[PDB]
Amino acid sequence: ASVYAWNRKRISNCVADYSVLYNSASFSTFKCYGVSPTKLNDLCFTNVYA
C-alpha cells in the first residue's frame, strides 16, 4: 500500500514463528519497542496487527 492508505491486517488464531523473521538477513531495519526481539517466541500475544 501507499503510506497515506496503509494496509492493516489482523493476525489471529495461529502460531507465529518470529525466529524466521529476526534471523532473516533481508530486513535492513528491525527496531522493536517495548519488547525484546528474541523474547517474541516465549510470549503469547493478543490483538496482533500488521
Partner: protein, 49 residues
C-alpha cells in the same frame, strides 16, 4: 468509642501496611509494575533501566 486510643494505633499500623502493599502496584514510570513481565519482555540492557 471508649477504646479509641488503642484502635487508632491498630488502624494506623494496618493502614501503613496496606499502603506499603499498595505501592507495589505502581510502576513509577516504568512500562509495568510486574517484574516478571519486564524480565520476560525485555533484553537486560533496557530491563536494567
Amino acid at each position: 468509642s471508649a477504646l479509641g486510643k488503642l484502635q487508632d494505633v491498630v488502624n494506623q499500623n494496618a493502614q501503613a501496611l496496606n499502603t506499603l502493599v499498595k505501592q507495589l502496584s505502581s510502576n513509577f514510570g516504568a512500562i509495568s509494575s510486574v517484574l516478571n513481565d519486564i524480565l520476560s519482555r525485555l533484553d537486560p540492557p533496557e530491563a536494567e533501566v
